[PDB]
Design a protein around this nucleic acid. Structure first.
Ligand SMILES: [Mg+2]
Ligand SMILES: [Mg+2]
Ligand SMILES: [Mg+2]
Ligand SMILES: [Mg+2]
Ligand SMILES: [Mg+2]
Ligand SMILES: [Mg+2]
Ligand SMILES: [Mg+2]
Ligand SMILES: [Mg+2]
Ligand SMILES: [Mg+2]
Ligand SMILES: [Mg+2]
Ligand SMILES: [Mg+2]
Ligand SMILES: [Mg+2]
Ligand SMILES: [Mg+2]
Ligand SMILES: [Mg+2]
Ligand SMILES: [Mg+2]
Ligand SMILES: [Mg+2]
Ligand SMILES: [Mg+2]
Ligand SMILES: [Mg+2]
Ligand SMILES: [Mg+2]
Ligand SMILES: [Mg+2]
Ligand SMILES: [Mg+2]
Ligand SMILES: [Mg+2]
Ligand SMILES: [Mg+2]
Ligand SMILES: [Mg+2]
Ligand SMILES: [Mg+2]
Ligand SMILES: [Mg+2]
Ligand SMILES: [Mg+2]
Ligand SMILES: [Mg+2]
Ligand SMILES: [Mg+2]
Ligand SMILES: [Mg+2]
Ligand SMILES: [Mg+2]
Ligand SMILES: [Mg+2]
Ligand SMILES: [Mg+2]
Ligand SMILES: [Mg+2]
Ligand SMILES: [Mg+2]
Ligand SMILES: [Mg+2]
Ligand SMILES: [Mg+2]
Ligand SMILES: [Mg+2]
Ligand SMILES: [Mg+2]
Ligand SMILES: [Mg+2]
Ligand SMILES: [Mg+2]
Ligand SMILES: [Mg+2]
Ligand SMILES: [Mg+2]
Lengths: 110, 127, 57, 117
RNA sequence: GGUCAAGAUAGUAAGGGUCCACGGUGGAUGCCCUGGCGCUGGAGCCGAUGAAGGACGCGAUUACCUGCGAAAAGCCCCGACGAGCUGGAGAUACGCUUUGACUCGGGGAUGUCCGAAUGGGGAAACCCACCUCGUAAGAGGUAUCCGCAAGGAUGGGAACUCAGGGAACUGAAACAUCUCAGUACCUGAAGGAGAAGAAAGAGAAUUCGAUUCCGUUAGUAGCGGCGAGCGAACCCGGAU
RNA sequence: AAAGGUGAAAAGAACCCCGGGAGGGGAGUGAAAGAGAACCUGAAACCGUGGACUUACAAGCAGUCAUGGCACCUUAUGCGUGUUAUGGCGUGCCUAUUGAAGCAUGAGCCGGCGACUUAGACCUGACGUGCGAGCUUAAGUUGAAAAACGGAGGCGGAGC
RNA sequence: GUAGGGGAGCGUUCAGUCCGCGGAGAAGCCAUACCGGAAGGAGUGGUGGAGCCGACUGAAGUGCGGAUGCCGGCAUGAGUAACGAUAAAAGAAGUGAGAAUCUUCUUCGCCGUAAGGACAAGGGUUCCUGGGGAAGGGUCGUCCGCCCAGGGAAAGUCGG
């Protein structure tokens, strides 16, 4: 019963966009979209961040070894930001050129 | 403390001088026969008696005894020359079941039972 | 033919019966040399001593 | 719609079972034999309310006869003696006089053998 | 106090019992949904251009499933979306993609072998041929029935339809006519419906006007070991 | 045929201790490992450890009543709660039967599943409601996050 | 007071409406000496981790101890019978975490128109090598016809 089903496998933001974290423990911290998976609705933001363990495997290296890497998040705790407001912001689809669709707020655009 | 959740954050439960062998492929009443000798007795003794008891079970039970020792010494900094088997018991694991043929058409079900051996070491002063 | 029990035996009964299955713990002595423990009139299984030294290491 | 048992049967059961503590063996741990034991218990309860009323009267009477005879009187003659002198005492009370207070019971004896004369 | 004497009573539990505490077993109960159920409405045929259903394959690694078919998790063009993708599979590596990928919609190309199987044989998925072209590789053809030909047929499809054939238990408080019942089942042919249909009619008003279906007439008229029980039609009102 | 459930998120427990392993104890993560992959709750039968009071002169459907002993004090210092000693009293349940403790039937135990219902626009009573010498529609039509129309028919109205 | 008739109610799911609770923790589970005439119902505490109580009204797959009932789990018999031909074993040595059971050596014993060898039918990787040890082996296993991986099968003349 996949996570994307509810959100029509659609991402409300692109990869490389900056994002503010709406909900949870990392309220409001900000970051670049390093990875975004539409169907699963999961997204990586240089702020979440956990300590993972590499257990036995002799690759990498015989001993264990711990590690610091960010752990992806659910789309619905992510938003495009607005350079003016600087805050959590909705999006309007308007037009430019020359056939390009673009994204505005209450004061375009990102 | 104000909330159960508060306690579940603040304390964390400890199992002071306690080891458990789970799913030992033996029968409880058997294993008990052995254990009842170990119990109340001062850890050293237990270590010996287990080497001269001529049941099979004697061996898994030896092993749990040592595990509880290494949990009271290491993970609990207790005093060897004062350790004794404060408590020990056996309870029933999920028992393996297998069909076995019998005479004429009849079939049967052997219960290869399993076992949970539990030892709990603890220091003993008289005062 | 083919006897069978008439009635389930109570937990109480069954257990009264079992009042004799207590194992008997070894009488154990400590070897006069290498020092662990041994059975009377057996060879001390740690060193191998029975007055001088019989079984091997 | 369907309506499972959900929750009711276990509540009933625990009710019986909890009436049944201290009962021997399965009588206190298996529902049916509990419930059963309890039917017979019913009989015994009702009966014995009446019957204890029967029993205590008996006891009083025993003690009374005893005291009566200490001072050289049978009980029956002692009680007609009391009714004659229109002393109107409970035998519960007569027993307690007889057992607890010597001289007083004595006095009632003398009064009664007087009523007999 | 000591000895003797007479008398009375206590504790210890090998194991058991009742209760309490703490666990194990086990999977009830509560909560939940990724799975069902019915009703309503939609939609209704596939196939010699090889179907339904399969076998064997295709993967960097591939046992199962999915998708595909030696052009083999896919190839071509068109349309949509616009940043991810590299199937369930979550696993490492290789990599693809803003010259527009992946996914969605729409057509085509390829489509091994079996299966109506149809070159001949055969114990389905395998064995053996013949003919025309071709340099070989390869390609195509080689069944039967209607027809001059063109072209049509064979096979499959839960229910629904019509047709050929057609039970018994059971009910009659036994049973034989009767009833179950033209039901079950079998065979046939066909469609998305089919059947039926354009009065040598129903009927009694010199009335009505192709058929089917619903209500109703009506448990009426009748049928019947006149027993059990079976049971219309006309009129009238609707659907078309 | 049976089959279901970590967690919000795999952050799926590096590393240390006993063990060949299995399993476990730490640590670390987590809000919670009183969620660790034999992972939601986790009842009962059933198996054990520990503690209270108890039991080795005793005849018993195991209860019930009365009293004494010990113990305990969160609807609890009394009408007590647990447990016991002794006395009185007492023939399991169901079914089937003239008659059941019956040496008559059923039953190992606990948990779940498990048996008087639906239909018709049928028949006949009781209760209630709306109209009332009258009462009512059916198919259907339209509307339909509702209902309204629809008199064809049916019931009373006279019996013999 | 049995069949039976009648009367008033308790509890369960779902439904409409009203009230209203719930992470400062719901349902479910657990303990309990309180309440009600009974079905039953609350108070507090422990559990649990996301839903739910009360009231009135409506509709039911609505209440279990029985049916040698059904599915499931766990008891009893019980550490009992048995461990599958009475052809038979002994020592050393090796290995190994662990050996009466595995490997080697020396003997012993049992088949020898068989208990040896080769085809067919059938089976289907069981063969060989290297590893493994949960379960399968009626004990034990370090071993195996088991588990994992990789190899192995060659026809003008045998059979089709
Ligand atoms: Mg009286
Ligand atoms: Mg003892
Ligand atoms: Mg396949
Ligand atoms: Mg090709
Ligand atoms: Mg394209
Ligand atoms: Mg897309
Ligand atoms: Mg062919
Ligand atoms: Mg017949
Ligand atoms: Mg008949
Ligand atoms: Mg056909
Ligand atoms: Mg481990
Ligand atoms: Mg912490
Ligand atoms: Mg005890
Ligand atoms: Mg005597
Ligand atoms: Mg005694
Ligand atoms: Mg009789
Ligand atoms: Mg009778
Ligand atoms: Mg009997
Ligand atoms: Mg009987
Ligand atoms: Mg009979
Ligand atoms: Mg029997
Ligand atoms: Mg009326
Ligand atoms: Mg009465
Ligand atoms: Mg409600
Ligand atoms: Mg509910
Ligand atoms: Mg039952
Ligand atoms: Mg039987
Ligand atoms: Mg069973
Ligand atoms: Mg024995
Ligand atoms: Mg026996
Ligand atoms: Mg024997
Ligand atoms: Mg034997
Ligand atoms: Mg043998
Ligand atoms: Mg032998
Ligand atoms: Mg060695
Ligand atoms: Mg042997
Ligand atoms: Mg050698
Ligand atoms: Mg041979
Ligand atoms: Mg072969
Ligand atoms: Mg074995
Ligand atoms: Mg090894
Ligand atoms: Mg081999
Ligand atoms: Mg040759």
């Amino acid at each position: 019963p996949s996570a994307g089903s509810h959100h029509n496998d659609k991402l409300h933001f692109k990869k490389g966009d900056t994002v503010i974290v709406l909900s949870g423990k990392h309220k409001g911290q900000t970051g670049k979209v390093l990875l975004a998976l539409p169907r699963d609705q999961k997204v990586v933001v240089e702020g979440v961040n956990v300590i993972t363990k590499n257990v036995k495997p002799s690759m990498t290296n015989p001993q264990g070894g711990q590690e610091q890497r960010e752990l992806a998040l659910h789309a619905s705790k992510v938003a495009l930001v607005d350079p003016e407001t600087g805050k959590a912001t909705r999006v309007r689809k308007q037009i430019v050129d020359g056939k390009k669709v673009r994204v505005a707020v209450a004061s375009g655009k990102t | 403390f104000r909330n159960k959740k508060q306690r579940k954050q603040q304390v964390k439960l400890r199992k002071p001088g306690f080891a458990v062998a789970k799913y030992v492929r033996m029968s409880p009443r058997k294993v008990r026969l052995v254990v009842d000798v170990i119990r109340g007795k001062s850890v050293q003794d237990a270590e010996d008696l287990l080497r001269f008891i001529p049941r099979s079970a004697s061996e898994p039970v030896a092993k749990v005894l040592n595990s509880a020792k290494a949990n009271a010494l290491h993970n609990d900094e207790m005093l060897e020359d004062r350790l004794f088997v404060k408590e020990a018991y056996v309870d029933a694991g999920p028992t393996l079941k297998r069909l076995i043929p019998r005479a004429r058409g009849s079939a049967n079900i052997i219960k290869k039972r399993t076992s949970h051996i539990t030892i709990i070491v603890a220091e003993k002063g008289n005062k | 033919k083919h006897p069978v029990p008439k009635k389930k035996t109570s937990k109480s009964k069954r257990d009264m019966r079992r009042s004799h299955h207590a194992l008997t713990a070894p009488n154990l002595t400590e070897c006069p040399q290498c020092h662990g423990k041994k059975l009377s009139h057996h060879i001390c299984p740690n060193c191998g001593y029975y007055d001088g030294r019989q079984v091997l290491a | 719609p369907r309506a499972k048992t959900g929750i009711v049967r276990r509540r009933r059961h625990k009710k019986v079972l909890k009436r049944a503590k201290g009962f021997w063996g399965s009588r206190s741990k298996q529902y049916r034999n509990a419930f059963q034991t309890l039917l017979n218990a019913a009989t015994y309860e009702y009966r014995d309310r009446r019957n204890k009323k029967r029993d205590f009267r008996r006891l009083w009477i025993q003690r009374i006869n005893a005291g009566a005879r200490l001072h050289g009187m049978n009980y029956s003659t002692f009680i007609n003696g009391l009714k004659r002198a229109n002393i109107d005492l409970n035998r519960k009370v007569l027993a307690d006089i007889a057992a607890r207070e010597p001289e007083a019971f004595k006095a009632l004896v003398d009064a009664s053998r007087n009523a007999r004369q």
